[PDB]
Every structure is written in structure tokens, then in C-alpha cells.
Design a protein around this ligand. Structure first.
Ligand SMILES: [Mg+2]
Length: 124
């Protein structure tokens, strides 16, 4: 399953890249903003998207909205990473169609769980 990790911060991508590797997922690509992510997703082949919220050029919510509006990309599982205490962001993400969310900072256990929920939910 090919994952696309989107985050404008290198540390954030490295944290997610290592946790996935630990969980056994070695097919992981990275993008630094919503535009960079869409350029890659349009190329095809992806099976899961993990996206940061605040990013320049195109943020995570706009990215999610774009994915969901696109016929070829609309069915992609999208896990949004929201900041601690930004309750409105979780609500806006759910309304926009996020498959789930995870609040940063998160542990490896929390991340595995959120992933497990989506897999079960979408039946993967
Ligand atoms: Mg960011």
C-alpha cells in the first residue's frame, strides 16, 4: 500500500516515515505542501494520505477538499494531523470528508490505532 506523507516540516515527515516503517510499511513517499502532494497523487498509485494542517501554497484542508472533489482521487483514505487543542479543525476536517484525524503530538500507539480504525472502517 503506497502512502503519501504531507508536511511542510522535515521533522514531522521523518516522525511519520519512521512509525510507518516500524509498522511494516516500506512504500512511503513524501510531499511538502498541498500542491506537491496533488502533483504526486495525480501520477496515480497511492493508497493512503497522511496530511499536516498548516502548510504554505495549499494547506491540508484545501488539499482534502481538492482530493474529495476529484473523481479519481475521491475514494482515498485521508488521515488529517491536527494541532493540540484546535477542536474546530477536527470538525471542519470531518465535514470535509477526512477518513480520520490524529492530534499532534501523537505516539506510535495512537497512530497505529487511527490507522487501524480507517482500515476497518473502509474495509481494507
Ligand atoms: Mg505544517
Amino acid at each position: 500500500l503506497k502512502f503519501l506523507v504531507v508536511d511542510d516540516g522535515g521533522t514531522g515527515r521523518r516522525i511519520v516515515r519512521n512509525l510507518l516503517k516500524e509498522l511494516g510499511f516500506n512504500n512511503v513517499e513524501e510531499a511538502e505542501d498541498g500542491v506537491d502532494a496533488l502533483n504526486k497523487l495525480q501520477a496515480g498509485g497511492y493508497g493512503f494520505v497522511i496530511s499536516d494542517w498548516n502548510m504554505p501554497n495549499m494547506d491540508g484542508l484545501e488539499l482534502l477538499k481538492t482530493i474529495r472533489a476529484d473523481g479519481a482521487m475521491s475514494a482515498l483514505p485521508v488521515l488529517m494531523v491536527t494541532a493540540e487543542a484546535k477542536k474546530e479543525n477536527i470538525i471542519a476536517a470531518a465535514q470535509a470528508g477526512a477518513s480520520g484525524y490524529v492530534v499532534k503530538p501523537f505516539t506510535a500507539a495512537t497512530l497505529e490505532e487511527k490507522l487501524n480504525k480507517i482500515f476497518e472502517k473502509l474495509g481494507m
